[PDB]
Amino acid sequence: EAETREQKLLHSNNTENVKSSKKKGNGRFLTLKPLPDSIIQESLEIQQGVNPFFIGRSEDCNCKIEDNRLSRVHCFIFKKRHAVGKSMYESPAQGLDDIWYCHTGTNVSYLNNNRMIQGTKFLLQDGDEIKIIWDKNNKFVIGFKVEINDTTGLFNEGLGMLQEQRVVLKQTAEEKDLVKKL
């Protein structure tokens, strides 16, 4: 209980939160945690792989990294079905969904160790510290930390199942003829 019962708004204690004042994870998959080394500092939340989740100096992106070096829609993250490797394989992965970091601005964004060169795409993983921007010449880096908290049906449960087999992939499908408009 908490209130006399039915008055401010209605029903059981805190209405047992049917619509729920609380929520957390109602459609969240990744929490972008920018660190202090990055001009940004806190934690963002990409909803269940918004697909796509742009990010840059233009709020038009699914997020906002307020960083001048960003050319508006500076970087462009995407999300889609894992899609098993083309050929061979034994147990595919129908369903699930992989993420795709893809820089599209005029500059370059990256993923821990893979430097993208605009209009480029790349795969993302859990705890994948990314860097929307990186200009050591004038002390300006956007250190970020991809933190997958859901991983419900996320293929590979988000955990970079590898040691060294994921390099930046140039654009594709014209930013899927959808991210190409930014």
What are the DSSP calls for the chain, one per residue?
A: --SSSSSSS-SSTTGGGSS-S--SSSS--EEE---TTSSS-S---BTT--SSEEESSSTTSSS----TTS-SS-EEEEEE-----SS--SS---S--EEEE---SSS--EETTEE--SSEEEE--TTB--EEEEEGGGTEEEE--EEES--SS-GGGSS--SSS----EE--HHHHHHGGG-
Q: How was this structure determined?
A: NMR
Q: Which structural domain range is residue 128 located in?
A: 1-182
Tokens read off for 163? 């040691």
- The CATH number that applies at residue 145 is 2.60.200.20
Q: Give the strands of the sheet with 110-111, arranged side by side.
A: 114-115, 110-111, 131-135, 140-143
Q: Go through 50-78 and write b for each residue having 16 or more CB atoms within 10 A of its CB, e for each that does not.
A: bbbbbbbbeeebbbbbebebbbebbbbbb
How far apart (Å, rounded) are the C-alpha atoms in residues 84 and 94? 8
Q: Provide the β-strand partners of residue 31.
A: 147
Tokens read off for 150? 């859901």
Contacts of 59 (CB under 8 A, 6+ apart): none
How far apart (Å, rounded) are the C-alpha atoms in residues 7 and 98? 45
Contacts of 81 (CB under 8 A, 6+ apart): 95, 96, 97, 98
Contacts of 25 (CB under 8 A, 6+ apart): 149, 150
Peptide bond into 52 cis (omega under 30): yes
**What's the domain count of the chain?**
1
- Positive/negative CA dihedral, 45, 49, 53, 55: positive
How far apart (Å, rounded) are the C-alpha atoms in residues 75 and 73? 6
β-pair type (98-101, 120-123): antiparallel
